[PDB]
UniProtKB/TrEMBL annotation, chain A:
This is CHAT domain protein. Residues 484-611 form the CHAT domain.
From TrEMBL, chain B:
This is RAMP superfamily protein. Zn(2+) 10 binds at residues 697, 702. Zn(2+) 2 binds at residues 83, 116. Zn(2+) 9 binds at residues 694, 699. Zn(2+) 8 binds at residues 694, 697, 699, 702. Zn(2+) 4 binds at residues 116, 125.
RNA sequence: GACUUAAUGUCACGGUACCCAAUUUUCUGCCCCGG
């Protein structure tokens, strides 16, 4: 009839959309046309539509949900909505009469996707019952259909005995290496062959981008393995972290997938559980796992789509990641200068602990201490909430936060963890980036500041450390008139200095690697895109991306930012602080170090920093803060508030 | 003791279905509404119930108020210090509270002398219930030192009586589209706004703090708050089903949509339109009556069925009856008809931290209240879902999206600006002002510390409602098909809009320590002043310029909450008295309120100047339409009593001065027509208009004009007519008619009248409109908009309807001075000669008598080309341009202005005599572009052997079959596009395809003006001989003769006889049978423009050949062609081709030659007589006397006893009608032979 | 009273029903011989 001709055209369109060679942007149009034919044919036929056409719509709606990538951290409701629509479309084929076999294949595969993105609307009990119903209806045919492998192996994770179907599952060449590994682990309960096949899975994961469906299931498998208390998860999580580290190298761009953090949390927790020189090499590995996580920041797909040499590389990466999403369904750590100490912070979420990985360059010693960050995070949130309302008047809430950093991290003031005279490079993690660790006060009476003993530097990650200039001082000011008028008239400011109304082009115009660049402008933060957070310069301002692509004359330059980090990065509504400041972009474009306030501070103190920095630029920042009221948090918390704001972001 | 507390609401408060704490987690709507008023179902029917506010919610509000009160006074109330209280429970120690606080707790320095406990406690710890016998599990009310009962509604009550379900939104800031939506119940605060509850307080120590906090609670359940211590629908649906079925039996089910729109529009005309029978009746030429109001429903006309339906439903009122009948009709139509959407919108709802916020000691906390008026600067829209979909408790696989959209009103039908929409617009504009804001996360356990969210937490708005409550106007929109430039079927959709100039009460309350520079910037951005437009974009359809509101009468008063907190609490912050705050003066202010003298001006506000002011650029310009503009309101023509087929669009405007809708509606081009002209203008030059789909589309048209994923960066407002007072008659009646190709006469059913705005070249219509360009336009997209604007100026896009016959032709545009400087900075003869005919040339002294008309018996071969030329782009190989043509009259020309049947004013002395003036607009003489087009089309259809586009097929003979069966099948009018289009229908268009030539009105230029005839009562006039209906029986005498072909009329000076016969035409012929008309003279010059686009090389050449065929070939135009009137010569003054170059004569001749070859290609210095049908055509249009040749051409008289008959001629129809004198075949052969003599018949 | 709260913790004023669509395309107010 005319229905079969239209359904066959819809089927041949769905087959084209199911072709992995189809582009994702073209696949969505194809399913649109196939669903245009199928829905319109369903509109006329209504309930009298044949079951093969209802399987066709369910197949089309399964493909629809494949093209709906998560635009944020949460799984989209359109994706749920599309699988929900396919399930009630396939229910019309289940309830009205090989066809039932093809109907249950797509019903169960839709339900597997629905279960993993919506555990409440399709829980494991309901999924298990319908997965079994497909199995007893002949949906165990793994040789020609890759979906029955997913049906059976999903039942393996559900605890259903599939010993009878194991032999044909392994024999089938359509089964994935991870799927073969899951079959060995769940059915045969043998760990040697599950190791062999997972290793072939993770070896292949070095080439599949992290948006691929296989990345989520591999990490989900290790989560199952960790929750099963098996010994396989420790070796597996490290091995797939290594594949992630390899895949990350292919702008500090990282695709956001939910299981990425738990992968690093699992890999960190695996190496921590394995931690003479072997123990130390494990702690070294902890800092490399932590550094690999902070080396890049995940960008949400909506921000990736809402983004010019970088435009090409972004479009290559965004297209590659989006394609691989839908394809699944169809500097050395010890190169620190002598006399320094590097504290790598890692906040595990899988466990409640934060971990401080310190490296003493003199001792060549790796040691780590765990701390509780939950109570500290609330004290930071109290400070952040109070600062965002009262600014300087929240200096009392800064003192308790600084007292909390010294109480939650007593090892900062322990000589074994961090020696006395050593310069400390802080590589914090998540909300510890917003923590004035230099301003921490040890949990003791008349506790001294951390900066009174150690010259503190900061890094978003160890991978931002550089190796390295003129004698010119450049002032790029786009600030309000009331502030820095006296600082303008300083004679030391060079001819490249745009001392009033400086623009984005003015920052790009710098070419001679000035000894000190002083940008006094306002900061504004894109709350979702670190790349779009900008320094409020003239002619529209200059973003993080524009600094990356357009500023080339700051090689080894010391940068003083008049914009507070609170302006540059958004406030934290979660433990994560994956937002790179505009100072991170300045580090990537070769600046030796960026000095700026961590929070809003009256411009007199910022100017007092710059004039102090104008002479003897190699001055240590902590020596200034000790003599400018940093040591006085009991007496004048406002004066402790202003000096603790200044931190150095960079590394020689 | 027991305190009885009255809880009253001053705006619609939110209601939620009550679920117990355990059962509440299962529903996302109820967890969303834990802070709302609760609805229990009080029955087994789920229709009637009880509303109530839990005492836990009142207690939460009161505890929040106590925190703020004690933070204002640094932790004490009336001198007794309070500790910080407790707001953290250990899970190990005990069970957690049913509600966990996510917000920041206001804390102070606890200056209480002793730590609070069971024995002694501060008033705060008493009010919290920290140290009484009552705990997380309720046992009995005696354990509660402070107790809050459930606050019951004071008024069984049905849910639909109290609450109305409304879908709310979360619009993405960057795209302008809604991320998701969520439903809510908005309960009616005017009828069900008072809730009574008992607050028992055993500890007197906290009495003063409790009463103060009761006076301080500002909001509850989503509404402003004062806490005081003290079925015709089903029958109309069945009848609408009856009407829809009756339309289906008529095969007019598509007319049910316009019938629903018309019946809904009837609510603006009162019940008198249906009882006094004021609905239009259609023309008297059609015995079927009106095409809509005379459709038989159950054997009676729809106009009387509507009268019976109204008589049955008089009780519910006229507006409700028309609204619900039209709604039922629309819903049935949507059900039967079933653009295609695969997925619907997402209905989305929705870490234990104590965050102590300690405000600085001595910080001044004030409450600034901004009272003003929100004036609708443009027609506004606040989208509400369909009422059948929004029934609370009954809220509604195939995504059948709604096509008709309603505006948001309250129960009294007053327009409301909801607090949710005003708040969303304010958040959007504050995010613009700050330059940085969050996308609103919905389940955050941590408060968003973005500057927008920090300030929006202190901002409280109010639900605005207008006193005006007259029905909204329905704005109908169509999607044009890009390829055919016609209406896409089923693409008609409409929204209800509120009138512009409508005014709403604006209340903004800011509770903070300093008034932010950004909120002040947003208020100034929204404010309207001298030389500034209010820029409050509220609601939907901002792209079509809907909902641009202006803040006016802005007064800012600040409460001093540190020293006048008792005056604030006494006045309840004037939370229902803001309309009285706006009216009162400074002297009548309450004690705590002072005027805020510090509101900064616009130029002093950095967020305004750098973020808000440049965000939208106004491009205001005036369109000059020197043409009769007809942007038709198709529904209005169905409801106004004027019996008018096409009337100009006009809109209702509210006047705040008179507090009423202005009695005279303003004519305007709709902002949607304004928007869609630009969108096609941009899309045709970019080629984006021809794209099959726009999904995830980043094309130039999708970037500028948006799509379903991103909102438009350009917003178009209506093009208001600003000249209406200059016209003594704005509305101009113009009659058009289709002429049968064969009979040469008008089809009776094909007559139609338009009612455009009387624009003319001398007196054009000034149309002042504007659009808004968003900040961030690229240079190339800004260049596209100016190119689109220049395309409108050049006349490429006529406004409104009938642009092909010269309507809506833009004479020019005038850019206003305030337009950004960047924006305004980027904005012959035909030598051919026909040999004539042998018979008149060899006739010296003009003895032969010729028939006034002859037929073009061309062959059956019609070249119907299936590769239809698309309208969606300007094809490079095709030709687009404008032909400036000069129209010279060789004989007197008659174009009657048939709107005035008594234009010469001589029916008083000669009753029944049809007298017309020459066609004119605003006094200047014009040839309507329809007349010029229909006379080019008839020529072009004859030249190109096209189909008989206009044919009276149903007309019978006297015989076996009608003329449709008698005409050849290939000669029938081109129907549809599945079969090809003939060259005439390809060039001039069908009803399924817009023609590629537009003909402007021919303005009179120069000449002797009228034909002056002494003895005629008007000297400019000439009483014509009778113009009787053409007789096809003469052309087809027998059942075997076929249709002889296209009737053309000879060029002769037979009008001279008519002019000489003037004194005896009036006396002899009956005044009713004949007409007198103002007559133009020979040598009068008219200038008209032929605008063509996407023309082939040969089609422009054949069109140029059709315009000017030769030295001695001209056209017959207007009335009296058989009497020799209307011989008109067109010569091309200039030809221009776009991509604008003046085409030289050599290139013109190449076009004409290329058209010459296409004609011989279908046949099987060009010489046009070599093709037999063109030679016969050009003989029929050959003009003698242009040479000692004055052929005498006239019709034979009936009998010997007939006037105007010369004895002995034997020319009468008695001789010619007899088959004995001459055979029928030779009569037809002589009828199909141009210029063949008829008195000495050949 | 109960319906119908839970109490040392309710940012839901925490969320613009938003977003896309030209009421238009075609049509000469024309005109002679038989009830
Ligand atoms: Mg208690
Ligand atoms: Zn207390
Ligand atoms: Zn926010
Ligand atoms: Zn597009
Ligand atoms: Zn045709």
């Amino acid at each position: 009839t005319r229905e079969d001709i239209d359904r066959k055209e819809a089927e041949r369109l769905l087959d084209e959309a199911f072709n992995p060679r189809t582009k994702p942007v073209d696949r969505k149009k194809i399913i649109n046309s196939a669903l245009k034919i199928l829905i319109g044919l369903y509109k006329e036929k209504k309930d009298d539509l044949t079951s093969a056409s209802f399987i066709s719509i369910a197949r089309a709606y399964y493909l629809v949900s494949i093209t709906i990538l998560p635009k944020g951290t949460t799984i989209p409701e359109k994706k749920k909505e599309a699988l929900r629509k396919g399930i009630e479309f396939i229910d019309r084929a289940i309830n009205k009469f090989l066809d039932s076999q093809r109907a249950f294949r797509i019903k169960s595969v839709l339900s597997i996707e629905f279960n993993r993105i919506d555990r409440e609307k399709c829980d494991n009990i309901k999924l298990k019952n319908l997965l079994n119903e497909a199995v007893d209806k002949g949906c165990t045919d793994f040789d020609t259909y890759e979906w029955d492998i997913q049906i059976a192996i999903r039942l393996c994770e559900l605890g259903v005995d599939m010993e009878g179907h194991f032999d044909n599952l392994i024999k089938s060449n359509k089964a994935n290496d991870l799927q073969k590994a899951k079959a060995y682990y769940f059915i045969k309960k043998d760990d040697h062959k599950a190791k062999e096949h997972m290793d072939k899975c993770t070896a292949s994961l070095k080439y599949t981008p992290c948006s691929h469906r296989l990345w989520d299931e591999t990490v989900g498998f290790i989560e199952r393995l960790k929750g099963d208390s098996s010994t396989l998860w420790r070796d597996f999580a490290i091995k797939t972290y290594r594949s992630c580290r390899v895949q990350e190298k292919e702008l500090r761009l990282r695709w956001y997938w939910s299981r990425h953090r738990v992968l690093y949390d699992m890999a960190f927790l695996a190496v921590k559980e394995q931690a003479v020189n072997v123990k130390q090499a494990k702690i070294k590995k902890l800092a490399e796992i932590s550094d690999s996580l902070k080396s890049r920041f995940s960008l949400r797909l909506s921000d990736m789509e809402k983004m010019d040499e970088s435009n090409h590389e972004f479009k290559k990466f965004l297209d590659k990641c989006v394609t691989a999403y839908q394809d699944g369904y169809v500097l050395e750590l010890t190169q620190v200068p002598e006399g320094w100490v590097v504290v790598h912070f890692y906040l595990n979420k899988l466990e409640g602990m934060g971990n401080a990985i310190v490296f003493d360059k003199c001792a060549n010693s790796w040691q780590y201490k765990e701390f509780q960050y939950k109570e500290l995070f609330e004290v930071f949130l109290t400070w952040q909430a109070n600062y965002n309302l009262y600014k300087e008047n929240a200096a009392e809430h800064l003192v308790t936060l600084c007292k909390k950093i010294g109480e939650t991290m007593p090892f900062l003031f322990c000589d074994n963890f961090i020696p006395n005279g050593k310069d400390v490079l802080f590589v914090p993690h998540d909300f510890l980036h917003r923590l004035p660790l230099h301003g921490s006060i040890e949990n003791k009476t008349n506790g001294k500041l951390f900066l009174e003993n150690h010259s503190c530097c900061y890094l978003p990650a160890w991978s931002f450390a550089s190796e390295k200039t003129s004698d010119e001082y450049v002032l790029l000011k786009n600030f309000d008139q009331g502030h820095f008028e006296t600082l303008q008239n300083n004679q030391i400011w060079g001819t490249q200095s745009v001392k009033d109304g400086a623009s984005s082009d003015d920052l790009e115009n710098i070419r001679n690697n000035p000894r000190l660049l002083t940008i006094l402008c306002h900061g504004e933060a894109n709350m979702s895109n670190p790349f779009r957070s900008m320094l409020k310069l003239a002619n529209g301002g200059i973003t993080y991306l524009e600094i990356l692509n357009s500023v080339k004359g700051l090689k080894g330059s010391q940068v003083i930012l008049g914009a507070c980090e609170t302006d540059l990065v958004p406030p934290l509504s979660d433990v994560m602080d994956e937002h790179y400041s505009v100072a991170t972009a300045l580090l990537l474009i070769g600046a030796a170090g960026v000095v700026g306030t961590m929070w809003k501070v009256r411009s007199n103190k910022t100017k007092s920093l710059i004039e102090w920095k104008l002479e003897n630029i190699e001055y240590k920042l902590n020596e200034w803060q000790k003599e400018t009221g940093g040591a006085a948090y009991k007496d004048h918390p406002p004066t402790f508030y202003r000096s603790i704001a200044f931190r150095s972001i960079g590394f020689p | 003791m027991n305190i009885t507390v009255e809880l009253t609401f001053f705006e619609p408060y939110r209601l939620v279905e009550w679920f117990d704490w355990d059962a509440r987690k299962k529903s996302h709507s109820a967890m969303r509404g834990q802070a709302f008023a609760q609805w229990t179902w009080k029955g087994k029917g789920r229709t009637a119930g009880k509303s109530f506010i839990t005492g836990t919610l009142v207690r939460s509000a009161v505890i929040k108020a106590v925190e703020e009160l004690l933070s204002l006074n640094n932790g004490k109330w009336e001198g007794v210090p309070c500790c910080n209280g407790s707001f953290q429970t250990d899970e190990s120690k005990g069970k957690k509270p049913s509600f966990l606080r996510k917000r920041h707790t206001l804390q102070w320095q606890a200056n209480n002398k002793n730590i609070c406990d069971k024995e002694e406690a501060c008033p705060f710890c008493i009010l919290l219930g920290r140290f009484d016998n009552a705990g997380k599990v309720h046992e009995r009310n005696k354990d509660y030192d402070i107790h809050f009962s459930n606050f019951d509604l004071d008024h069984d009550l049905r849910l639909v009586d109290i609450a109305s379900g409304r879908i709310l939104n979360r619009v993405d800031f960057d795209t302008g589209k809604a991320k998701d939506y969520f439903r809510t119940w908005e309960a009616d605060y005017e009828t069900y706004g008072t809730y009574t509850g008992r607050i028992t307080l055993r500890n007197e120590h906290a009495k003063k703090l409790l009463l103060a906090s009761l006076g301080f609670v500002d909001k509850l359940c989503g509404a402003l708050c004062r806490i005081e211590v003290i079925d015709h629908n089903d029958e109309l649906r069945k009848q609408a089903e009856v009407i829809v079925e009756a339309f289906k039996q008529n095969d007019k089910l598509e007319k049910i949509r316009i019938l629903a729109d018309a019946i809904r529009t009837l609510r603006l005309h009162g019940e008198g339109v249906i009882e006094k029978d004021e609905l239009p009746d259609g023309k008297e030429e059609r015995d079927k009556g009106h095409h809509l109001w005379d459709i038989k429903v159950q054997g009676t006309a729809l106009r009387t069925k509507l009268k019976e339906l109204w008589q049955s439903n008089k009780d519910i009122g006229w507006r409700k009856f028309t609204e619900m009948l039209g709604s039922n009709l629309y819903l049935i139509y949507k059900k039967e008809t079933g653009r295609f959407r695969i997925l619907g919108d997402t209905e989305y709802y929705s870490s234990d931290l104590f965050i102590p916020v300690t405000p600085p000691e001595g910080i001044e906390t004030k409450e600034w209240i901004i009272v003003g008026r929100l004036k609708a600067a443009t027609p506004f829209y606040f989208g509400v879902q369909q009422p059948s979909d929004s029934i609370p408790g009954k809220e509604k696989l195939v995504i059948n999206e709604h096509t008709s959209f309603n505006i948001l009103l309250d129960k009294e039908n007053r327009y409301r600006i909801p607090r949710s929409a005003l708040r969303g617009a304010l958040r959007r504009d504050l995010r613009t002002a700050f330059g940085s804001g969050c996308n609103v996360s919905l389940g955050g356990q941590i408060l968003c510390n973005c500057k927008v969210c920090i300030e929006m937490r202190r901002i409280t708005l109010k639900d605005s409602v207008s006193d005006f409550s007259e029905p909204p106007e329905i704005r109908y929109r169509i999607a044009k098909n890009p390829g055919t430039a016609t209406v896409e079927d089923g693409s008609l959709f409409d929204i209800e809009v509120g009138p512009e100039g409508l005014t709403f009460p604006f209340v903004l309350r800011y509770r903070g320590h300093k008034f932010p520079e950004q909120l002040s910037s947003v208020i100034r951005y929204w404010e309207e002043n001298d030389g500034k437009n209010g820029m409050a974009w509220l609601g939907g359809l901002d792209s079509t310029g809907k909902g641009r509101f202006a803040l006016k009468d802005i007064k800012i008063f600040e409460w001093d909450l540190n020293q006048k907190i008792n005056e604030y609490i006494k006045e309840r912050g004037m939370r229902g008295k803001e309309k009285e705050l706006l009216e009162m003066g400074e002297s009548s202010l309450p004690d705590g309120l002072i005027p805020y003298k510090f509101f900064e001006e616009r130029e002093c506000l950095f967020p305004y100047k750098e973020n808000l002011k440049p965000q939208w650029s106004e491009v205001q310009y005036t369109i000059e339409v020197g043409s009769p503009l007809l942007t038709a309101d198709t529904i209005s023509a169905l409801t106004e009593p004027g019996n008018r087929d096409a009337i100009a669009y006009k809109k209702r405007v509210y006047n705040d001065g008179n507090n009423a809708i202005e009695p005279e509606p303003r004519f305007a081009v709709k902002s949607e027509t304004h928007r869609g002209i630009f969108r096609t203008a941009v899309g045709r030059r970019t080629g984006d208009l021809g794209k099959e789909d726009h999904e995830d589309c980043t094309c130039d048209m999708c970037i500028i004009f948006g799509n379903e994923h991103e909102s438009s960066k350009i917003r178009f407002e209506d093009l208001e007519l600003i000249n209406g007072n200059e016209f003594e008659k704005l509305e101009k009646h113009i009659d058009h008619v289709a002429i049968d190709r064969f009979t040469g006469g008008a089809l009776d059913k094909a007559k139609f009248d338009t009612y455009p705005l009387a624009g003319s070249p001398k007196k054009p219509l000034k149309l002042k409109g504007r659009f808004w360009i968003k900040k961030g336009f690229s240079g190339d997209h800004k260049l596209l908009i100016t190119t689109a604007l220049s395309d409108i100026r050049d006349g490429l896009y006529p406004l409104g309807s009938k642009g092909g016959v010269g309507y809506g032709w833009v004479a020019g545009i005038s850019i206003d001075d305030n337009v950004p400087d960047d924006f305004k900075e980027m904005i012959i003869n035909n030598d051919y000669v026909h040999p004539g005919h042998q018979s008149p040339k060899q006739d010296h002294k003009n003895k032969n008598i010729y028939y006034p008309h002859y037929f073009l018996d061309s062959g059956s071969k019609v070249y119907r080309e299936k590769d239809i030329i698309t309208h969606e782009e300007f094809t490079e190989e095709l030709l687009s341009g404008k032909i400036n043509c000069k129209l010279e009259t060789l004989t007197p020309l008659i174009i009657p202005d048939t709107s005035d049947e008594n234009g010469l004013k001589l029916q008083g002395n000669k009753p029944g005599h049809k007298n017309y003036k020459f066609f004119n607009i605003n006094g200047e003489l014009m040839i309507p572009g329809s007349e010029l087009r229909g006379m080019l089309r008839t020529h072009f259809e004859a030249l190109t052997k096209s189909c008989f586009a206009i044919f009276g097929e149903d007309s019978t003979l006297s015989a076996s079959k009608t003329l449709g069966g008698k005409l050849d099948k290939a000669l029938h009018p081109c129907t549809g596009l599945s079969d090809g289009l003939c060259p005439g229908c390809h060039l001039f268009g069908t009803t399924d395809y817009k023609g590629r030539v537009k003909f402007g009105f021919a303005k009179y230029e120069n000449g002797p003006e009228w034909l002056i005839t002494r003895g005629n009562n008007p000297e400019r006039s000439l009483t014509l001989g009778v113009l009787e209906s053409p007789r096809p029986a003469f052309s087809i005498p027998d059942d075997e003769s076929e249709i002889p072909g296209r009737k053309f009329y000879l060029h002769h000076n037979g009008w001279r006889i008519i002019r000489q016969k003037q004194l005896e035409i009036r006396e002899t012929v009956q005044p009713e049978r004949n007409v007198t008309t103002e007559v133009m003279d020979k040598g009068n010059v008219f200038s008209f423009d032929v605008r063509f686009e996407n023309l082939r090389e040969w089609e422009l050449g054949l069109l140029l050949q059709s315009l000017d065929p030769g030295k001695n070939i001209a056209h017959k135009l207007g009335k009296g062609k058989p009497y020799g009137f209307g011989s008109v010569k067109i010569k091309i003054d200039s030809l221009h081709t776009f991509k604008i170059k003046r085409v030289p004569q050599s290139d013109i001749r190449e076009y004409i030659n290329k058209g010459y070859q296409k004609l011989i290609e279908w046949s099987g210095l060009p010489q046009w007589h070599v093709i037999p049908h063109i030679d016969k055509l050009y003989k029929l249009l050959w003009v003698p006397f242009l040479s000692k040749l004055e052929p005498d051409v006239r019709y034979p008289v009936l009998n010997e006893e007939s006037k105007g008959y010369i004895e002995g001629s034997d020319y009468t129809y008695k001789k010619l009608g007899d088959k004995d004198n001459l055979p029928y075949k030779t009569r037809v052969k002589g009828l199909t032979t141009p210029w063949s003599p008829w008195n000495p018949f050949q």
